[PDB]
Design a protein around this motif. Structure first.
Motif, short mmCIF file in Angstrom:
data_model
loop_
_atom_site.label_atom_id
_atom_site.label_comp_id
_atom_site.label_asym_id
_atom_site.label_seq_id
_atom_site.Cartn_x
_atom_site.Cartn_y
_atom_site.Cartn_z
N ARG A 37 36.24 39.80 44.09
CA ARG A 37 35.95 40.64 45.34
C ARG A 37 35.92 39.85 46.73
N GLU A 38 35.65 38.61 46.53
CA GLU A 38 35.56 37.55 47.60
C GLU A 38 36.71 36.82 47.68
N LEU A 39 37.98 37.12 47.03
CA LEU A 39 38.98 36.13 47.24
C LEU A 39 39.79 36.37 48.50
N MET A 40 40.05 35.25 49.18
CA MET A 40 40.42 35.34 50.48
C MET A 40 41.58 36.22 50.81
N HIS A 41 42.37 36.33 50.03
CA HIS A 41 43.88 37.36 50.41
C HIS A 41 43.55 38.62 50.60
N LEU A 42 42.51 39.36 49.85
CA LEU A 42 42.25 40.49 49.86
C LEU A 42 41.84 41.28 51.30
N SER A 43 41.25 40.64 52.11
CA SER A 43 41.02 41.28 53.58
C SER A 43 42.20 40.88 54.43
N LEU A 44 43.07 39.89 54.07
CA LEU A 44 44.47 39.82 54.86
C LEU A 44 45.36 40.94 54.35
N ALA A 45 45.28 41.61 53.15
CA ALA A 45 46.11 42.48 52.72
C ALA A 45 45.83 43.69 53.53
N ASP A 46 46.94 44.73 53.40
CA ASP A 46 46.97 45.86 54.02
C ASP A 46 46.34 47.05 53.10
N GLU A 47 46.08 46.88 52.04
CA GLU A 47 45.56 47.56 51.00
C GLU A 47 44.85 46.68 50.07
N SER A 48 44.02 47.32 49.27
CA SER A 48 43.07 46.26 48.33
C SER A 48 42.76 47.46 47.25
N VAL A 49 43.08 47.32 46.08
CA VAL A 49 42.21 48.13 44.94
C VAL A 49 41.71 47.29 43.81
N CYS A 50 40.72 47.67 43.58
CA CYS A 50 39.76 47.17 42.41
C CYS A 50 40.18 47.90 41.06
N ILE A 51 40.86 47.10 40.20
CA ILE A 51 41.43 47.61 39.19
C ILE A 51 41.02 47.47 37.53
N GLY A 52 39.65 46.99 37.76
CA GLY A 52 38.91 46.83 36.58
C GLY A 52 37.95 45.76 36.77
N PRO A 53 37.25 45.68 35.55
CA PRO A 53 36.05 44.47 35.42
C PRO A 53 36.65 43.10 35.22
N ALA A 54 35.86 42.09 34.97
CA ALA A 54 36.15 40.58 35.35
C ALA A 54 37.15 40.05 34.17
N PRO A 55 36.85 40.63 32.93
CA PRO A 55 37.86 39.89 31.98
C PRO A 55 39.32 40.32 32.40
N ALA A 56 40.19 39.25 32.26
CA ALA A 56 41.49 39.46 32.61
C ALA A 56 42.18 40.60 31.55
N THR A 57 41.77 40.80 30.38
CA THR A 57 42.40 41.52 29.47
C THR A 57 42.13 42.97 29.66
N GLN A 58 40.91 43.04 30.74
CA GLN A 58 40.54 44.39 31.13
C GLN A 58 40.87 44.80 32.55
N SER A 59 41.69 44.11 33.32
CA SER A 59 41.87 44.05 34.56
C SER A 59 43.50 43.64 34.80
N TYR A 60 43.62 42.49 35.26
CA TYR A 60 45.17 41.79 35.52
C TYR A 60 46.01 42.08 34.39
N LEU A 61 45.87 42.18 33.16
CA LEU A 61 46.56 42.14 32.16
C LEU A 61 46.86 43.81 31.55
N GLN A 62 46.10 44.75 32.33
CA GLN A 62 46.25 45.92 32.18
C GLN A 62 47.32 46.71 32.84
N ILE A 63 48.59 46.97 32.12
CA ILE A 63 49.61 47.47 32.59
C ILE A 63 49.42 48.91 33.19
N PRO A 64 48.79 49.81 32.67
CA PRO A 64 48.62 51.18 33.18
C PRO A 64 47.72 51.23 34.43
N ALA A 65 46.78 50.13 34.67
CA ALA A 65 46.06 49.91 35.86
C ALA A 65 46.84 49.41 37.03
#
Length: 440
Positions: A37-65
């Motif tokens: 949530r604190e990542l610098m680029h988030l507040s520079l982005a036009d839109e920001s979506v929280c796609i899941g919990p901390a583990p990469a397998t449950q967020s950034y690697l989730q194709i459906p999300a």
């Protein structure tokens, strides 16, 4: 131009892509985990979506999300950066099937170059060999074994199907006897052995390409990434110093030809072992790389911006004759880890000060008050210097490192300060074994 790009990544590379997007007037969608949530680029982005919990397998690697986020936001393209889903063919494939644009090559090409055998064959057609050896297992027939070894050239290494049960042959008079013996030492259980050329001074040299998928491809020169620890790159430079110019021009031409032959689209890198005048292919990264900035500096080409232009349907822009390598660039990866034990150091950055001045570039998402989370890799910033020559790049990196403050966590800054004052590294041309031997 692409209307809206979803940045399917985090950290410095997410910020890198965001910057390229703004320069091109592209709207951005950031995705992040709850730990980011604190990542610098988030507040520079036009839109920001929280796609899941901390583990990469449950967020950034989730194709459906990611795909759900793209659909909710009306994104027309997805840039995967490096790591995570960038070389996941299933992801590129879903993006294709859903009608989005992938800022990268086709799933088919990602699969081609992600399999050792098909990748090898593709490069062979383009005229580029792999590390010489038996292809594959070394036969028991004596004269066939001796003929293969002679072409490979001594010394040779005899490996078991499984740095274990491994044996060097210096002269051909000892070949049969030694192969014989390496088979007996398995029962690993499997008595298959293969032959591989011993390389004396193996350097990691890689060629950067851009290809539009419409019949055009160019190179942006090469890089040396020989300073490695456990196969993790530490410092990179461009161009690779002390390379046979004829061999270089030949491998540039072959890399460009390969792009055209396999139908490559986007940014990609051909990794080689360079051994005293000869290039041997290891793999193609079908994506942007961490160390792309050094090639940007010496060529004046913005690699991420070109990716985006290509993804939007444009042909290159740049002809090969417009690409001139001038000067020399260095990059130090600033990792949040112990500089001697390499234990990750998550924690709060009380104070971050970046280096500045002429020929100093900084690609980092660090800021004062930011907490580096424990969940992901240790890369927190990249310090990149550019000079008229290698010595000037080194001198500027010395200055830059003296000004870098990342207070509150441990980093590998001290190791970098040592490396840019190290005699062998400053003379240049150290090989892939250098850093681990020096560290112990």
């Amino acid at each position: 131009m692409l209307e809206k790009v979803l940045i399917a990544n985090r950290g410095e590379i997410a910020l890198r892509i965001l910057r390229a997007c703004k320069e091109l007037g592209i709207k951005t969608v950031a995705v992040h985990s709850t730990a980011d949530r604190e990542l610098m680029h988030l507040s520079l982005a036009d839109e920001s979506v929280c796609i899941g919990p901390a583990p990469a397998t449950q967020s950034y690697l989730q194709i459906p999300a990611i795909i759900a986020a793209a659909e909710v936001t009306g994104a027309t393209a997805i840039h995967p950066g490096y790591g995570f889903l960038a070389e996941n063919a299933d992801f590129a494939e879903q993006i294709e099937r859903s009608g989005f644009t992938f800022v990268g090559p086709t799933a088919e090409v990602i699969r081609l170059m992600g399999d050792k055998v098909s990748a090898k064959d593709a490069m062979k057609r383009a005229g580029v060999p792999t590390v010489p050896g038996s292809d594959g297992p070394l036969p028991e027939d004596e004269e066939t074994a001796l003929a293969i070894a002679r072409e490979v050239g001594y010394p040779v290494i005899i490996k078991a199907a499984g740095g274990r049960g491994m044996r060097v042959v210096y002269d051909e008079s000892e070949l049969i006897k030694s192969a014989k013996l390496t088979r007996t030492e398995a029962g690993f259980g499997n008595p298959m052995v293969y032959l591989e050329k011993f390389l004396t001074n193996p350097r990691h040299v890689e060629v950067q390409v851009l290809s539009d998928g419409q019949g055009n491809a160019i190179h942006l020169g090469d890089r040396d990434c020989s300073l490695q620890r456990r196969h993790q790159k530490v410092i990179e430079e461009a161009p690779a110093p002390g390379i046979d110019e004829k061999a270089r021009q030949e491998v540039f031409a072959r890399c460009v030809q390969a792009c055209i032959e396999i139908g490559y689209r986007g940014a990609g890198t051909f990794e080689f072992l360079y051994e005293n005048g000869r290039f041997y292919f290891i793999e193609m990264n079908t994506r942007v790389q961490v160390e792309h900035p050094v090639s940007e500096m010496v060529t004046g080409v913005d690699i991420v911006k070109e990716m985006l232009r290509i993804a939007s349907g444009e042909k290159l822009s740049i002809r090969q004759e417009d690409v001139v390598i001038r000067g020399h660039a260095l990059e130090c990866r600033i990792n949040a880890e112990d500089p001697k034990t390499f234990m990750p150091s998550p924690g709060k950055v009380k104070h971050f000060h970046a280096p500045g001045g002429n020929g100093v570039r900084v690609d980092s998402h660090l800021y004062s008050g930011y907490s580096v989370p424990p969940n992901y890799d240790s890369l927190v910033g990249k310090v990149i210097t550019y000079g008229a020559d290698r010595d000037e790049a080194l001198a500027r990196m010395r200055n830059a490192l003296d000004e870098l403050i990342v207070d509150g966590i441990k980093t590998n800054t001290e190791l970098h300060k040592d490396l840019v004052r190290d005699a062998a590294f400053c003379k240049g041309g150290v090989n892939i074994h250098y850093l681990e031997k020096k560290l112990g």
